[PDB]
Amino acid sequence: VGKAAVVKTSSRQTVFLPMVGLVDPDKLKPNDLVGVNKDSYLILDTLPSEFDSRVKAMEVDE
Amino acid sequence: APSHLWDIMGDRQRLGEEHPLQVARCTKIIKKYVINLKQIAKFVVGLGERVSPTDIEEGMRVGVDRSKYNIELPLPPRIDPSVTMMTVEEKPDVTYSDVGGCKDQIEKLREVVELPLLSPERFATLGIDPPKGILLYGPPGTGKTLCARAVANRTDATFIRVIGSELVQKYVGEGARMVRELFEMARTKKACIIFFDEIDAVGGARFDDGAGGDNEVQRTMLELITQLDGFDPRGNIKVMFATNRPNTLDPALLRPGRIDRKVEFSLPDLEGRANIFRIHSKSMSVERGIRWELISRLCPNSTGAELRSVCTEAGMFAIRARRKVATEKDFLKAVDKVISGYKKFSSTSRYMQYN
């Protein structure tokens, strides 16, 4: 089987990539937004501690 | 002629690539900027050469280059709505002196609106809070919309006229966005005036068990009340609610805390209706030696809409009745014509006060 990771771009394009040393299988998880390369389509960045986003609005007042 | 001068500087602004920027709204700020395009595409970028780190804010449209994405120039947010651009008028024709009468429907409005704008330091000594909202309903036909335009002339600032049917759109939920479109310009443009017209088609609870399609309109006020007084008391300018049916409104909308000054128009008396013909006496043609106090006395209590009809129709008798100017005889004929002749049916005045 081996170690592999399948991702899908926000443009609806499914690209297969081999396991990258910058990421670990413990940190990886399906249905996750991570940075990928435009040319080689390799993940160079992990999840920046936020699931998706605040979408429409959010209250930042302290 | 102007095209020749612009072609000289058009070498650097056309051949080179600067303007072809892709505008999109920024989401996350890491101090890496996550920005979602209009095509639903997420990416990461950073500041530019002349870009300041304090200019980029959360939820703001930021143009970036299409080839290599980078922040170039910031743009004001909320670029989608095109509707509120036409809602702002300029220089209304009705002046402040066009409103007739010495009664209390004038002085009460200028103290809660024009006074804090012209002299904000007057009430600062006592340390009080000027009324945020006002209340003007009155009977139909008193020219209430004319009083709203008289305030915009003395203010010399941005005026916003909102129709009650404009808040309701052709989609469910779009009316909620229409509310924030009005309050977004309050923080962007300070010291402006917003005016709502015919709020009866919007307000009211109307509950549930009715026809069932009524739940879309009741959410407009709940969005309007939240944007007016929410969890965070965000407000600057004055808010004006106006309609012809105060009884059909929301009983919560009829209670203070969103509104302080409440003024209801009334029918002018013999002394009040006299000034209605005096402001019109400077216009048209008035015969020397005619007393207008006897004309307003023969006329019963009626709204200002039918009061101005006396002076307008009086000029019509100069043709068929064989008269040069408007005389006292033509004024008596207007009593049985402008008033007694036009009563019949479909005459409002005080007829409909409720529903």
CSV table of C-alpha atoms in Angstrom, one decimal:
chain,number,residue,atom,x,y,z
A,1,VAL,CA,0.0,0.0,0.0
A,2,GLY,CA,2.6,2.5,1.2
A,3,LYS,CA,2.1,6.1,2.3
A,4,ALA,CA,0.2,8.4,0.0
A,5,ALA,CA,-2.1,11.5,0.2
A,6,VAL,CA,-4.9,12.5,-2.2
A,7,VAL,CA,-6.0,16.1,-2.3
A,8,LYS,CA,-8.5,18.1,-4.4
A,9,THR,CA,-8.0,21.7,-5.4
A,10,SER,CA,-10.6,24.5,-4.9
A,11,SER,CA,-10.9,24.5,-8.7
A,12,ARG,CA,-12.4,20.9,-8.5
A,13,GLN,CA,-9.2,19.1,-9.8
A,14,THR,CA,-8.2,15.9,-8.1
A,15,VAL,CA,-4.4,15.4,-8.1
A,16,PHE,CA,-2.5,12.5,-6.6
A,17,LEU,CA,0.8,13.2,-4.7
A,18,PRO,CA,3.2,11.0,-2.8
A,19,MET,CA,3.8,11.3,0.9
A,20,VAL,CA,5.8,14.5,1.6
A,21,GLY,CA,8.3,14.7,4.4
A,22,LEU,CA,7.0,18.1,5.4
A,23,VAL,CA,3.7,16.5,6.6
A,24,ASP,CA,3.1,13.5,8.9
A,25,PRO,CA,0.2,11.0,8.8
A,26,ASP,CA,-0.8,12.0,12.4
A,27,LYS,CA,-1.3,15.7,11.4
A,28,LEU,CA,-2.9,14.8,8.1
A,29,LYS,CA,-6.6,14.0,7.9
A,30,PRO,CA,-9.3,13.8,5.2
A,31,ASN,CA,-11.4,16.9,4.5
A,32,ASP,CA,-8.7,19.4,5.3
A,33,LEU,CA,-7.5,22.6,3.6
A,34,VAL,CA,-3.7,22.8,3.2
A,35,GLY,CA,-1.4,24.7,0.9
A,36,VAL,CA,-0.3,23.0,-2.3
A,37,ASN,CA,2.0,23.8,-5.2
A,38,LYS,CA,0.7,25.3,-8.4
A,39,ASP,CA,3.2,23.4,-10.6
A,40,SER,CA,4.3,20.2,-8.9
A,41,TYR,CA,1.0,20.0,-6.8
A,42,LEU,CA,2.9,19.1,-3.6
A,43,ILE,CA,1.9,20.1,-0.1
A,44,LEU,CA,4.4,22.5,1.4
A,45,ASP,CA,2.3,23.8,4.3
A,46,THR,CA,0.3,22.1,7.0
A,47,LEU,CA,-3.1,23.3,8.5
A,48,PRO,CA,-2.7,26.8,10.0
A,49,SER,CA,-4.7,25.9,13.2
A,50,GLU,CA,-8.0,26.8,11.6
A,51,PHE,CA,-10.6,24.3,10.2
A,52,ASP,CA,-12.0,26.3,7.3
A,53,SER,CA,-12.7,30.0,8.0
A,54,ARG,CA,-15.2,32.5,9.6
A,55,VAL,CA,-17.1,32.5,6.3
A,56,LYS,CA,-19.5,35.5,6.4
A,57,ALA,CA,-19.0,37.3,9.7
A,58,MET,CA,-17.3,36.9,13.0
A,59,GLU,CA,-17.1,38.9,16.3
A,60,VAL,CA,-13.5,39.8,17.1
A,61,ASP,CA,-14.3,42.1,20.0
A,62,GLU,CA,-12.5,41.2,23.3
B,1,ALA,CA,-9.5,67.2,-27.3
B,2,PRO,CA,-9.1,65.6,-23.8
B,3,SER,CA,-8.1,62.2,-25.4
B,4,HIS,CA,-4.9,63.7,-26.8
B,5,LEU,CA,-3.5,64.6,-23.4
B,6,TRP,CA,-4.3,61.2,-21.9
B,7,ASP,CA,-2.6,59.3,-24.7
B,8,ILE,CA,0.8,60.7,-23.7
B,9,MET,CA,0.7,59.2,-20.2
B,10,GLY,CA,-1.0,56.1,-21.5
B,11,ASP,CA,2.3,54.5,-22.4
B,12,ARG,CA,3.2,53.3,-18.8
B,13,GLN,CA,-0.5,52.7,-17.8
B,14,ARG,CA,-1.3,50.4,-20.7
B,15,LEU,CA,1.7,48.6,-22.2
B,16,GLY,CA,3.1,47.7,-18.7
B,17,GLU,CA,1.1,45.3,-16.5
B,18,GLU,CA,-0.3,47.1,-13.4
B,19,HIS,CA,-4.1,47.5,-13.6
B,20,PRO,CA,-4.9,43.8,-14.6
B,21,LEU,CA,-5.4,42.8,-10.9
B,22,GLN,CA,-7.7,40.1,-9.6
B,23,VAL,CA,-9.9,41.6,-6.8
B,24,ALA,CA,-10.9,39.2,-4.0
B,25,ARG,CA,-11.9,39.4,-0.3
B,26,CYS,CA,-9.3,38.5,2.3
B,27,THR,CA,-10.1,36.0,5.1
B,28,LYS,CA,-7.3,35.1,7.5
B,29,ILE,CA,-4.4,37.5,8.5
B,30,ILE,CA,-1.2,35.9,9.8
B,31,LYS,CA,1.3,38.4,11.1
B,32,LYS,CA,0.5,34.4,5.0
B,33,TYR,CA,-2.9,35.8,3.9
B,34,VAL,CA,-5.7,33.4,2.9
B,35,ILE,CA,-7.9,35.1,0.2
B,36,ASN,CA,-10.8,33.5,-1.7
B,37,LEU,CA,-11.4,34.6,-5.3
B,38,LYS,CA,-14.7,35.2,-7.1
B,39,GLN,CA,-14.2,31.8,-8.8
B,40,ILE,CA,-14.0,30.2,-5.3
B,41,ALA,CA,-10.3,29.6,-5.2
B,42,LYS,CA,-8.2,29.9,-2.1
B,43,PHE,CA,-4.5,30.9,-2.0
B,44,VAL,CA,-1.8,32.4,0.1
B,45,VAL,CA,0.0,35.8,-0.4
B,46,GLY,CA,1.8,38.6,1.4
B,47,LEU,CA,2.4,42.3,1.4
B,48,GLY,CA,3.8,44.3,-1.5
B,49,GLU,CA,6.4,47.0,-2.1
B,50,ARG,CA,4.4,50.1,-1.2
B,51,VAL,CA,1.7,48.1,0.7
B,52,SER,CA,1.4,49.1,4.3
B,53,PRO,CA,0.9,46.3,6.9
B,54,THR,CA,-1.9,48.2,8.7
B,55,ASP,CA,-3.9,48.7,5.5
B,56,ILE,CA,-4.9,45.1,5.2
B,57,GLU,CA,-7.9,44.3,7.3
B,58,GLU,CA,-10.2,41.3,7.8
B,59,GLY,CA,-13.1,41.0,5.3
B,60,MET,CA,-11.8,43.5,2.7
B,61,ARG,CA,-11.5,43.3,-1.0
B,62,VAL,CA,-7.9,43.2,-2.0
B,63,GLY,CA,-6.8,43.2,-5.6
B,64,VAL,CA,-3.9,40.9,-6.5
B,65,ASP,CA,-2.1,40.1,-9.8
B,66,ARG,CA,-3.5,37.3,-11.9
B,67,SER,CA,-0.2,35.8,-12.9
B,68,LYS,CA,1.8,35.9,-9.6
B,69,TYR,CA,-0.7,36.7,-6.8
B,70,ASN,CA,0.5,39.6,-4.6
B,71,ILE,CA,-1.2,42.4,-2.7
B,72,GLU,CA,-1.0,45.7,-4.6
B,73,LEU,CA,-3.8,48.1,-3.7
B,74,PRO,CA,-6.6,47.9,-1.1
B,75,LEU,CA,-10.2,48.6,-2.0
B,76,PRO,CA,-13.2,49.6,0.1
B,77,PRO,CA,-15.4,46.6,1.1
B,78,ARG,CA,-19.0,45.9,0.0
B,79,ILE,CA,-18.5,46.4,-3.7
B,80,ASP,CA,-21.3,44.0,-4.8
B,81,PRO,CA,-24.5,46.1,-4.1
B,82,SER,CA,-25.3,48.6,-6.9
B,83,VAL,CA,-28.7,49.5,-5.4
B,84,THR,CA,-27.7,51.9,-2.6
B,85,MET,CA,-25.7,54.1,-5.0
B,86,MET,CA,-28.9,55.6,-6.4
B,87,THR,CA,-30.6,55.9,-3.0
B,88,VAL,CA,-28.5,59.0,-2.2
B,89,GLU,CA,-30.0,62.3,-3.5
B,90,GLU,CA,-28.5,65.8,-3.7
B,91,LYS,CA,-29.9,69.3,-3.1
B,92,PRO,CA,-33.6,68.7,-2.6
B,93,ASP,CA,-35.9,71.3,-4.1
B,94,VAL,CA,-38.0,71.7,-0.9
B,95,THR,CA,-36.4,74.3,1.4
B,96,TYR,CA,-36.7,74.7,5.2
B,97,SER,CA,-39.0,77.7,4.8
B,98,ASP,CA,-41.5,75.7,2.6
B,99,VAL,CA,-43.1,74.2,5.7
B,100,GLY,CA,-45.9,76.5,6.8
B,101,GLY,CA,-47.3,77.1,10.3
B,102,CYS,CA,-45.9,78.1,13.7
B,103,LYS,CA,-46.9,74.8,15.3
B,104,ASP,CA,-44.7,72.4,17.2
B,105,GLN,CA,-44.0,69.9,14.3
B,106,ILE,CA,-41.0,72.1,13.2
B,107,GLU,CA,-39.0,73.1,16.3
B,108,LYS,CA,-39.2,69.5,17.7
B,109,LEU,CA,-37.5,68.0,14.6
B,110,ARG,CA,-34.7,70.5,14.3
B,111,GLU,CA,-33.6,70.2,17.9
B,112,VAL,CA,-33.2,66.4,17.8
B,113,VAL,CA,-31.6,66.4,14.3
B,114,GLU,CA,-30.3,69.7,13.1
B,115,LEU,CA,-29.2,70.9,16.6
B,116,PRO,CA,-26.6,68.1,17.3
B,117,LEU,CA,-25.2,68.3,13.8
B,118,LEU,CA,-24.8,72.1,13.7
B,119,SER,CA,-23.8,72.5,17.4
B,120,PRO,CA,-22.6,69.2,18.9
B,121,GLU,CA,-21.0,71.0,21.8
B,122,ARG,CA,-24.3,72.5,23.1
B,123,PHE,CA,-25.6,69.2,24.8
B,124,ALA,CA,-22.0,68.2,25.7
B,125,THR,CA,-22.1,70.5,28.7
B,126,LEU,CA,-25.0,68.7,30.3
B,127,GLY,CA,-23.6,65.3,29.3
B,128,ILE,CA,-26.8,63.9,27.8
B,129,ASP,CA,-27.5,61.5,24.9
B,130,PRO,CA,-29.3,63.0,21.8
B,131,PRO,CA,-32.2,61.0,20.5
B,132,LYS,CA,-30.9,58.5,17.9
B,133,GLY,CA,-34.3,57.9,16.2
B,134,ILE,CA,-37.4,59.9,15.7
B,135,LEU,CA,-41.1,59.2,15.0
B,136,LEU,CA,-43.2,60.9,12.3
B,137,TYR,CA,-46.4,59.3,11.1
B,138,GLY,CA,-49.4,61.7,11.1
B,139,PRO,CA,-52.5,61.5,8.9
B,140,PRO,CA,-52.1,61.0,5.1
B,141,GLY,CA,-52.0,64.2,3.2
B,142,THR,CA,-50.1,66.6,5.5
B,143,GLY,CA,-46.9,66.6,3.5
B,144,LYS,CA,-44.8,64.6,5.9
B,145,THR,CA,-42.3,63.7,3.2
B,146,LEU,CA,-41.9,67.5,2.6
B,147,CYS,CA,-40.7,67.9,6.1
B,148,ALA,CA,-38.0,65.3,5.6
B,149,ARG,CA,-36.6,67.1,2.6
B,150,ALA,CA,-36.6,70.4,4.5
B,151,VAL,CA,-34.2,68.9,7.1
B,152,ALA,CA,-31.8,67.7,4.3
B,153,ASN,CA,-31.5,71.3,3.0
B,154,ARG,CA,-30.3,72.8,6.3
B,155,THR,CA,-28.1,69.7,7.0
B,156,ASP,CA,-26.0,70.1,3.9
B,157,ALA,CA,-24.8,66.5,4.1
B,158,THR,CA,-25.6,63.0,2.7
B,159,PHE,CA,-29.4,62.2,2.6
B,160,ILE,CA,-30.7,58.6,2.1
B,161,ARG,CA,-34.4,58.0,1.2
B,162,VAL,CA,-35.5,54.4,1.7
B,163,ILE,CA,-38.7,53.0,0.3
B,164,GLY,CA,-40.4,50.3,2.4
B,165,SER,CA,-40.9,48.1,-0.6
B,166,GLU,CA,-37.3,48.4,-1.6
B,167,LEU,CA,-36.1,46.4,1.4
B,168,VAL,CA,-38.0,43.3,0.2
B,169,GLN,CA,-36.2,41.7,-2.7
B,170,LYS,CA,-37.1,38.8,-5.1
B,171,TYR,CA,-35.2,36.3,-3.0
B,172,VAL,CA,-35.6,35.0,0.5
B,173,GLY,CA,-32.8,36.3,2.7
B,174,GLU,CA,-31.6,39.0,0.3
B,175,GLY,CA,-33.6,41.6,2.4
B,176,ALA,CA,-31.3,40.9,5.3
B,177,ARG,CA,-28.3,42.0,3.3
B,178,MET,CA,-30.2,45.1,2.2
B,179,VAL,CA,-30.3,46.3,5.8
B,180,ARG,CA,-26.6,46.3,6.3
B,181,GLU,CA,-26.1,48.2,3.0
B,182,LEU,CA,-27.7,51.3,4.7
B,183,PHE,CA,-25.7,51.1,8.0
B,184,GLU,CA,-22.4,50.4,6.2
B,185,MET,CA,-22.5,53.9,4.7
B,186,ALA,CA,-23.1,55.3,8.2
B,187,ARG,CA,-19.6,54.4,9.3
B,188,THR,CA,-18.1,55.2,5.9
B,189,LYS,CA,-19.9,58.5,5.5
B,190,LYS,CA,-20.3,60.3,8.8
B,191,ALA,CA,-23.0,62.8,9.7
B,192,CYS,CA,-25.6,61.6,7.1
B,193,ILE,CA,-29.3,61.1,7.2
B,194,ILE,CA,-31.4,58.0,6.5
B,195,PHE,CA,-35.1,58.1,5.9
B,196,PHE,CA,-37.6,55.2,5.8
B,197,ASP,CA,-40.8,55.6,3.9
B,198,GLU,CA,-43.9,53.4,4.3
B,199,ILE,CA,-42.6,51.0,6.9
B,200,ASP,CA,-46.1,49.5,7.5
B,201,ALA,CA,-45.4,47.0,4.6
B,202,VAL,CA,-42.4,45.8,6.7
B,203,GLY,CA,-43.0,46.1,10.4
B,204,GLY,CA,-45.4,44.2,12.6
B,205,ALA,CA,-45.1,40.8,14.2
B,206,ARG,CA,-48.0,39.1,12.3
B,207,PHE,CA,-47.1,35.9,14.3
B,208,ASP,CA,-47.3,32.4,12.5
B,209,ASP,CA,-50.8,30.9,12.0
B,210,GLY,CA,-51.6,33.3,9.1
B,211,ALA,CA,-51.2,32.6,5.4
B,212,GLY,CA,-47.6,31.3,6.1
B,213,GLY,CA,-45.8,33.4,3.5
B,214,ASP,CA,-45.5,36.2,6.1
B,215,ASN,CA,-42.3,35.0,7.8
B,216,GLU,CA,-40.1,36.6,5.2
B,217,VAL,CA,-41.1,40.2,5.9
B,218,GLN,CA,-41.0,39.9,9.7
B,219,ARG,CA,-37.3,39.0,9.5
B,220,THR,CA,-36.5,42.3,7.8
B,221,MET,CA,-37.2,44.3,11.0
B,222,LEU,CA,-35.4,41.7,13.2
B,223,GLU,CA,-32.5,42.4,10.9
B,224,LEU,CA,-33.2,46.1,11.0
B,225,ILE,CA,-33.5,46.2,14.8
B,226,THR,CA,-30.3,44.1,15.2
B,227,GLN,CA,-28.4,46.5,13.0
B,228,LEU,CA,-29.9,49.5,14.9
B,229,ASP,CA,-29.6,48.3,18.5
B,230,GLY,CA,-27.7,45.0,18.7
B,231,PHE,CA,-25.4,43.4,21.2
B,232,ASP,CA,-22.9,46.1,20.3
B,233,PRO,CA,-24.5,49.6,20.4
B,234,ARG,CA,-23.2,50.7,17.0
B,235,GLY,CA,-24.7,53.9,15.7
B,236,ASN,CA,-23.9,57.4,14.7
B,237,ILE,CA,-26.5,59.2,12.5
B,238,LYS,CA,-30.2,59.7,12.9
B,239,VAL,CA,-32.8,57.1,11.8
B,240,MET,CA,-36.3,58.2,10.6
B,241,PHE,CA,-39.3,55.8,10.5
B,242,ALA,CA,-42.3,57.0,8.6
B,243,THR,CA,-45.6,55.5,7.5
B,244,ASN,CA,-49.3,56.1,7.2
B,245,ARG,CA,-50.4,53.2,9.6
B,246,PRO,CA,-48.9,53.4,13.1
B,247,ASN,CA,-51.4,50.9,14.5
B,248,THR,CA,-50.3,48.1,12.2
B,249,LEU,CA,-46.7,48.3,13.2
B,250,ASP,CA,-44.7,46.1,15.6
B,251,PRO,CA,-45.7,46.9,19.2
B,252,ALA,CA,-42.0,46.5,19.9
B,253,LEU,CA,-41.2,49.1,17.2
B,254,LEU,CA,-43.8,51.4,18.9
B,255,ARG,CA,-41.8,51.4,22.1
B,256,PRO,CA,-38.7,53.6,22.9
B,257,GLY,CA,-35.0,52.9,23.1
B,258,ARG,CA,-34.8,52.8,19.3
B,259,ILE,CA,-36.7,56.1,19.2
B,260,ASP,CA,-37.1,59.0,21.6
B,261,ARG,CA,-38.7,62.1,20.0
B,262,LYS,CA,-42.3,61.2,18.9
B,263,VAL,CA,-44.2,63.8,16.9
B,264,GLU,CA,-47.6,63.2,15.4
B,265,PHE,CA,-49.0,65.7,12.8
B,266,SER,CA,-52.4,67.3,13.4
B,267,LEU,CA,-54.8,69.3,11.4
B,268,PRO,CA,-54.1,73.1,11.6
B,269,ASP,CA,-56.7,75.2,13.3
B,270,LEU,CA,-58.2,78.5,12.1
B,271,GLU,CA,-54.9,80.2,13.1
B,272,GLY,CA,-52.9,77.3,11.6
B,273,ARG,CA,-54.7,77.0,8.3
B,274,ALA,CA,-54.2,80.8,7.9
B,275,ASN,CA,-50.5,80.4,7.5
B,276,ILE,CA,-51.0,77.7,4.9
B,277,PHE,CA,-52.5,80.3,2.5
B,278,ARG,CA,-50.0,82.9,3.5
B,279,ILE,CA,-47.0,80.9,2.2
B,280,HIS,CA,-49.0,80.4,-1.0
B,281,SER,CA,-50.0,84.1,-1.1
B,282,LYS,CA,-46.5,85.1,-2.3
B,283,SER,CA,-47.0,82.8,-5.3
B,284,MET,CA,-49.8,82.8,-7.9
B,285,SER,CA,-51.9,86.0,-8.1
B,286,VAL,CA,-53.6,87.5,-5.0
B,287,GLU,CA,-56.0,90.4,-5.3
B,288,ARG,CA,-55.2,93.3,-3.0
B,289,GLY,CA,-57.7,93.6,-0.2
B,290,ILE,CA,-58.7,89.9,0.1
B,291,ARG,CA,-58.7,88.3,3.6
B,292,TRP,CA,-57.5,84.7,3.5
B,293,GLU,CA,-58.7,84.0,7.1
B,294,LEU,CA,-62.3,83.8,5.9
B,295,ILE,CA,-61.5,81.2,3.2
B,296,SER,CA,-59.7,78.9,5.7
B,297,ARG,CA,-62.6,79.4,8.1
B,298,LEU,CA,-65.3,78.3,5.6
B,299,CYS,CA,-63.1,75.3,4.8
B,300,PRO,CA,-63.5,72.5,7.4
B,301,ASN,CA,-60.7,70.6,9.1
B,302,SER,CA,-58.7,68.9,6.3
B,303,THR,CA,-55.1,67.8,5.5
B,304,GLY,CA,-52.6,70.2,3.8
B,305,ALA,CA,-53.0,68.3,0.6
B,306,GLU,CA,-56.6,69.6,0.1
B,307,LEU,CA,-55.5,73.1,1.5
B,308,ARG,CA,-53.0,73.7,-1.3
B,309,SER,CA,-55.7,72.5,-3.8
B,310,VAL,CA,-57.6,75.7,-3.1
B,311,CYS,CA,-54.9,78.0,-4.5
B,312,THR,CA,-54.2,75.7,-7.4
B,313,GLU,CA,-57.8,75.3,-8.6
B,314,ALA,CA,-58.4,79.0,-8.1
B,315,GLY,CA,-56.2,79.7,-11.1
B,316,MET,CA,-58.4,77.3,-13.2
B,317,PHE,CA,-61.4,79.6,-12.9
B,318,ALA,CA,-59.5,82.3,-14.8
B,319,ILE,CA,-60.5,80.5,-18.1
B,320,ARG,CA,-64.0,79.1,-18.0
B,321,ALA,CA,-65.5,81.6,-15.5
B,322,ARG,CA,-64.2,84.6,-17.5
B,323,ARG,CA,-61.8,86.2,-14.9
B,324,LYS,CA,-58.5,87.9,-15.1
B,325,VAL,CA,-56.9,86.9,-11.8
B,326,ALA,CA,-58.1,85.0,-8.8
B,327,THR,CA,-60.8,87.1,-7.0
B,328,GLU,CA,-62.8,86.6,-3.9
B,329,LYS,CA,-65.8,85.3,-6.0
B,330,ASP,CA,-63.6,82.5,-7.4
B,331,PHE,CA,-62.5,81.7,-3.9
B,332,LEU,CA,-66.1,81.1,-2.8
B,333,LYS,CA,-66.8,78.9,-5.8
B,334,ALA,CA,-63.7,76.8,-4.8
B,335,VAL,CA,-65.3,76.2,-1.4
B,336,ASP,CA,-68.2,74.2,-3.0
B,337,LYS,CA,-65.7,72.8,-5.6
B,338,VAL,CA,-62.3,72.1,-4.1
B,339,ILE,CA,-63.8,71.0,-0.8
B,340,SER,CA,-67.5,70.3,-0.9
B,341,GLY,CA,-67.5,69.1,-4.5
B,342,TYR,CA,-64.5,66.7,-4.0
B,343,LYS,CA,-65.7,65.0,-0.8
B,344,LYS,CA,-67.9,62.2,-2.3
B,345,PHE,CA,-66.0,59.0,-1.7
B,346,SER,CA,-62.3,58.1,-2.0
B,347,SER,CA,-61.4,61.2,0.1
B,348,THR,CA,-59.0,60.3,2.9
B,349,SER,CA,-58.1,63.2,5.2
B,350,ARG,CA,-59.1,61.8,8.6
B,351,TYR,CA,-61.2,58.9,7.0
B,352,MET,CA,-58.6,56.2,7.5
B,353,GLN,CA,-56.7,56.6,10.8
B,354,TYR,CA,-56.2,52.9,11.4
B,355,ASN,CA,-56.5,50.3,8.7
